[PDB]
Design a protein around this ligand. Structure first.
Ligand code: ZHU
Ligand code: CL
Ligand code: CL
Ligand code: CL
Ligand code: CL
Ligand code: CL
Ligand code: CL
Ligand code: CL
Lengths: 189, 189, 189
């Protein structure tokens, strides 16, 4: 099996990366956007079970909670579902301010990689995609915010997830999308 | 020489990577989008000739053919051209479902890296871009699809392409862009 | 210290990478766009001072100057500012043709990573983002162009930037976004 690196108290395999497609740099409050995000096994070790976690982060206010946004997703060709508030970590508060809400977006991928027992194994070069629909409620803004993709994997089958609400005991390479929640640019000319 | 990995029977140099810009996460049937894709030599071995391949994949149906979409491209500062249906691979039907249509988008880049003999050598840190205009015919949809970038290179000068229709005898790191072909998100609010 | 590669006479740590979000593949002359770009320490060596450099490149004309566009940005949670032309490199003219304008987008990041003395250290896994507003004046176009992200860092505390107008004495991994400046695609159908 692969060897992990230490970030905080967690193990991280950089061979499991993630990519965003279609995240806008400015999101209008109240408006619904759809984007896709996918994690890909760039290593050679096939993980027996995998799922995506998504973290919503505002750097310049700490009142954001899970309830302030709507979140739906679909794992590859499986059906759409509403992201489960109980499958989230509790709000986390960096010492410099802000807040982030970690949301689990795991599940079978429609029988592409997923297996009849419910596991989503990740062989080399393979990938799992989440199509995501996201909307923040009106009246909430942020001037420096991000979505973060955090691949969760189970090192070995019988291992169990380490953070309550999120999938996995080891994690992949964090990928970022920075955005603003508010109004788009005035014309510079 | 450079190091290859064996996937299927093919040699793959991961140092030749690809990036997408401007791929939407939802594509409207009948509508034309333009995006860009470029492959970059992140390694140190200079390849004597290179060209881009693009793969369109539907995970949830196997009736897609080259004819069901229109595809134009332009290599860096060269002129626009229509992609050649004869420079495509035949339909492929993965066991994990669907069909994919592999398309060659090769050619001189307008004299940036390209040479008078038509070759596009790829030195370290250098990159080649295809600007791509894509439209699917009205009336065809997909709920989980991808565009894939597959950089093709000729290991040795005068080597011959190994997959009929596609450029290259060895290949780079596959890059994915997941999307849906259909209607956009309804308002969550 | 970390390990560098030599590109021209400059030292490059490929471990400091950059990502774009929201760069359109086609930019309309005169119009203002907002995108975000961020650089991340994918290595283990914490850099004592870092700042983003942004290169605007036209491959097919050499008359582009800094005066031909308007450029505003904000480092993470800090406020917007107009990019300083005196904090740009002189126009550079590749031997194959074209021109590129290297612009410094440095500054405190709003107290996230930045320190009271003004430096923006970059620990492992941490990141700095620029939100960018860009507009080209009407009447200049380009059919093959790019934005390039070049993380600039200070190897040792108190080091001096090496290229005039740009931040850093060593640099990170160049990241590209290819686009056209002109009219969007006509309908292919
Ligand atoms: C991911 C895309 C990649 C990896 C590239 O493709 C970059 C390559 C090729 C470019 O596309 C240029 C045709 C066009 C140049 C595009 C970007 C140009 C620079 C960032 C330019 C300014 C800052 C300096 C960075 C240090 C580290 C090297 C020096 C010389 C200089 C650099 C430059 O002068 C470049 C070059 O002379 C050639 N180069 C440069 O970055
Ligand atoms: Cl990643
Ligand atoms: Cl790649
Ligand atoms: Cl690339
Ligand atoms: Cl990737
Ligand atoms: Cl990079
Ligand atoms: Cl010139
Ligand atoms: Cl054009």
């Amino acid at each position: 099996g692969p060897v992990y690196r230490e970030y905080k108290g967690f193990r991280v395999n950089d061979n499991i990366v993630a990519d965003f497609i279609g995240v806008p740099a400015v999101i209008t409050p109240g408006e619904t956007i759809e984007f896709s995000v996918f994690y890909t096994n760039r290593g050679r070790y096939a993980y027996p079970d995998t799922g995506l976690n998504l973290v919503i982060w505002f750097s310049d206010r700490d009142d954001l909670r899970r309830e302030d946004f709507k979140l739906f997703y679909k794992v590859s060709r499986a059906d759409w579902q509403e992201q489960d508030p109980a499958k989230c970590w509790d709000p986390q508060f960096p010492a410099e301010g802000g807040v982030h809400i970690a949301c689990q977006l795991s599940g079978p991928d429609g029988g592409i990689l997923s297996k009849p027992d419910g596991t989503v194994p990740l062989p080399e070069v393979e990938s799992v995609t989440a199509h995501v629909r996201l909307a923040f409620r009106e009246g909430i803004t942020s001037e420096h915010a991000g979505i973060f993709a955090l691949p969760g994997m189970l090192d070995a089958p019988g291992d169990k997830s380490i953070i309550p609400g999120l999938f996995g005991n080891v994690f992949g390479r964090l990928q970022q999308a920075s955005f603003r929640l508010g109004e788009g640019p005035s014309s510079l000319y």
